[PDB]
Amino acid sequence: IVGEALEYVNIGLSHFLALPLAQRISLIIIIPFIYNIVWQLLYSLRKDRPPLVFYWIPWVGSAVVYGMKPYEFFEECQKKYGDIFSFVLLGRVMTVYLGPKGHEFVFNAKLADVSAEAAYAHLTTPVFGKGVIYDCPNSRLMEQKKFVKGALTKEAFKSYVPLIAEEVYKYFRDSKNFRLNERTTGTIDVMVTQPEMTIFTASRSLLGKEMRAKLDTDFAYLYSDLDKGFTPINFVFPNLPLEHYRKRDHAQKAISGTYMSLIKERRKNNDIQDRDLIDSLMKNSTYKDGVKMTDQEIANLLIGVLMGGQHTSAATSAWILLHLAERPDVQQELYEEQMRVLDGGKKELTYDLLQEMPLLNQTIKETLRMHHPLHSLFRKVMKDMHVPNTSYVIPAGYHVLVSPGYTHLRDEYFPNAHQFNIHRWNNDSASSYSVGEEVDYGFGAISKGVSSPYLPFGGGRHRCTGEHFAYCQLGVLMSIFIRTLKWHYPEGKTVPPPDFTSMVTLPTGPAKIIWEKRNPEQKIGGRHH
Numbered sequence: 001i002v003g004e005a006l007e008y009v010n011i012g013l014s015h016f017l018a019l020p021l022a023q024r025i026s027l028i029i030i031i032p033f034i035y036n037i038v039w040q041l042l043y044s045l046r047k048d049r050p051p052l053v054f055y056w057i058p059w060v061g062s063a064v065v066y067g068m069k070p071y072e073f074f075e076e077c078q079k080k081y082g083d084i085f086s087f088v089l090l091g092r093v094m095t096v097y098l099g100p101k102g103h104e105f106v107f108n109a110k111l112a113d114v115s116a117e118a119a120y121a122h123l124t125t126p127v128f129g130k131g132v133i134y135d136c137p138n139s140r141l142m143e144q145k146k147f148v149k150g151a152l153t154k155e156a157f158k159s160y161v162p163l164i165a166e167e168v169y170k171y172f173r174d175s176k177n178f179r180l181n182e183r184t185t186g187t188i189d190v191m192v193t194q195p196e197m198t199i200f201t202a203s204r205s206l207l208g209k210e211m212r213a214k215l216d217t218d219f220a221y222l223y224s225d226l227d228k229g230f231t232p233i234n235f236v237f238p239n240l241p242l243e244h245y246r247k248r249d250h251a252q253k254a255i256s257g258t259y260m261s262l263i264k265e266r267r268k269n270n271d272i273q274d275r276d277l278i279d280s281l282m283k284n285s286t287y288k289d290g291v292k293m294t295d296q297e298i299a300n301l302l303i304g305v306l307m308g309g310q311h312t313s314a315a316t317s318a319w320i321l322l323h324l325a326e327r328p329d330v331q332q333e334l335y336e337e338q339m340r341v342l343d344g345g346k347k348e349l350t351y352d353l354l355q356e357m358p359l360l361n362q363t364i365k366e367t368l369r370m371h372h373p374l375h376s377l378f379r380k381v382m383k384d385m386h387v388p389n390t391s392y393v394i395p396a397g398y399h400v401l402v403s404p405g406y407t408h409l410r411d412e413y414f415p416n417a418h419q420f421n422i423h424r425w426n427n428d429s430a431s432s433y434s435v436g437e438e439v440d441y442g443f444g445a446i447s448k449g450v451s452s453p454y455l456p457f458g459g460g461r462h463r464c465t466g467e468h469f470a471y472c473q474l475g476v477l478m479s480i481f482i483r484t485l486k487w488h489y490p491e492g493k494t495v496p497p498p499d500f501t502s503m504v505t506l507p508t509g510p511a512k513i514i515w516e517k518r519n520p521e522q523k524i525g526g527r528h529h
């Protein structure tokens, strides 16, 4: 008789439901804990799954160790498991594929296989607004990138260079952090100065003079408020009825409204030239199926572009200053190049002369090697994926994670990878190079292969289109810093470690340097109060 047993099943269920609150809570925690461990042990038997990093806390997974030191986490996992492994992260399964083959697996993945917008939209859509970037099909993203790229041309860079330079000099003149007309030396936190110089220079050139002028007003606080919504938390909790979530939403409306006001004014007065990215999107924001971007979508796109350029660039120029603060030999070498290319300062800086500054560009290139702003790029897997030359299948609903910044720091691909050396790029100073065949996903011909161990700007359909703007902006900024100042560390201070829990791998603050004027008597002209 198994009927007796079946009765006692029902009996036990009833005795289970009648447990005292103490055991119920205990079982509420013990039961999922035990199942999680048993599920992992069983999971490890599958040969059609990459190894899964073991974890104790259900749902949480490896989030703490991954979040604090992802490259150390990746190195340990790589030693135990090789280049392909999974780990649980706040309810999601991330499948990591390290090295150039991982770049290929994820950046060149078929459009049907993975989705960037499914990984990213819940964060970006609240900050930028509806209809653009990840709040739209990939084919719309492809053309938005084409629109923006049409404003980021050599001719645009030629006119951005003197504008960015004016903004840097104005910042040296007026910012409390410098005031070069009044002080010949001082101490700055580069995580204060660089966000400010970045937003001032990017506003002036991409958004134009009106939007730049707005940052000298209370309006600037909206950018700060909107900036707070750009945090990895939004990957988990994109919306919570908390205050800073509402300040973010309000900022997005207020800022996009400011942009729309300007757009509608310009159209009303027929004042549509070729000054800035706003002009360009007003003239060139019609999809190939004939639909026009709305004024709201244009403004949302402007927010996304400005916010994306903001954090990558400001972290990168901070890192450049930090690495050079302990390398007075590199500052000297860069200074000699400035004197040579600009004839002792008798030539004004232009976009073309910037391209004749290989050491300066190598300094940016090397900083981006050692400090990839984005340590982990993700896609959500939409269809099961066979990992070539393995028996592994990545099922739909998993996430794939690619980390070119991890490979940037591997000795095998960059000898003495943890040493800052701009001369490893001698006779190779371009921001990136297409080493073979090319392909066009909708926004211009880019490298077909994505197997370079150096991939600061990603590859494939989601490849960065800001790279040349970033080099222009960082180039102008660093040319002027080098020609104007020397800098060094407070005693006993050195390059800080990266903060891998922020949106970008910015330096852990406060990160202070001491600057001094190369020409204490040099004055910056212009009006100021």
Ligand SMILES: CC[C@@H](C)n1ncn(-c2ccc(N3CCN(c4ccc(OC[C@H]5CO[C@](Cn6cncn6)(c6ccc(Cl)cc6Cl)O5)cc4)CC3)cc2)c1=O
Pocket (backbone or CB within 6 Å): 063, 064, 065, 066, 067, 068, 120, 124, 133, 232, 304, 305, 307, 308, 309, 312, 374, 375, 376, 377, 378, 464, 466, 500, 501, 502, 503, 504
């Ligand atoms: C909770 C416990 C704690 C210990 N913990 N546990 C885990 N973590 C953690 C894990 C991972 C991460 N992150 C860091 C951020 N990261 C990430 C950030 C941005 C990103 O952007 C990719 C897309 C979307 O944004 C942009 C960024 N960009 C590109 N170029 C310039 N910016 C983008 C592209 C285009 C446009 Cl228009 C705008 C933008 Cl912002 O590209 C991708 C990954 C993911 C991992 C942070 C913390 C923790 O802190």
Ligand code: HEM
Pocket (backbone or CB within 6 Å): 116, 141, 145, 305, 306, 308, 309, 310, 312, 313, 316, 368, 373, 374, 377, 378, 456, 457, 458, 459, 461, 462, 463, 464, 465, 466, 467, 469, 470
């Ligand atoms: C040092 C500076 C920068 C670095 C290292 C960088 C890096 C990257 C990377 C790695 C990606 C791909 C993300 C992924 O594959 O998930 C990307 C995408 C992108 N970035 Fe940048 N970026 C920088 C600056 C900028 C700037 C200044 C802009 C705009 C002016 C910009 C706009 C974009 C856009 C539009 C995309 C396309 C995203 C997509 O198609 O999904 N970036 N960037």
